Write a structure and sequence with these properties.
part of a larger assembly, 2 chains, A: 68 residues, mainly alpha, 31% helix, 0% strand, rod-shaped, B: 48 residues, 3 helices, MmpS5 protein (chain A), MmpL5 protein (chain B), membrane protein, MmpL5
Chain lengths: 68, 48
């Protein structure tokens, strides 16, 4: 391999250098924005508790104030 | 846990919530106080 050893080793070295270049070149940057995760709850109406107000008396009418 | 049953804090459980709801009862009584003030005016007329 007197006339084969040189070009093969040259190609091997060039491939190694290209691989190193490709790997490290992309590491820079790659983190421009930060996006926080979202964890919401299911907004549904199943078995809602029911509150009832009742006003009654011997009078005809009344004035009523209440808290919703 | 028991204080966060669904993973979020229980509603109406902060101290500022208690503070911010302190004046609703006075607002509820407003009509009955206004009626008393009108009665005071009419009583002054009756005195006249």
């Amino acid at each position: 391999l007197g006339r084969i050893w040189l070009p093969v080793l040259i190609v091997v070295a060039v491939a190694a250098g290209a691989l190193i270049v490709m790997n490290v070149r992309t590491v820079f940057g790659s983190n421009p924005v930060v996006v926080t995760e979202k964890t919401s709850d299911n907004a549904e109406d199943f078995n809602p508790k029911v509150v009832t107000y009742e006003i009654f008396g011997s009078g005809s009418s009344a004035v009523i104030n209440y808290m919703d | 846990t028991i204080t966060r049953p669904d993973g979020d804090p229980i509603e109406h459980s902060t101290i500022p919530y208690t503070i911010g709801q302190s004046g609703t009862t006075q607002i509820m009584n407003n009509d009955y106080m206004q009626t008393n003030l009108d009665n005071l005016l009419k009583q002054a007329d009756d005195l006249q």
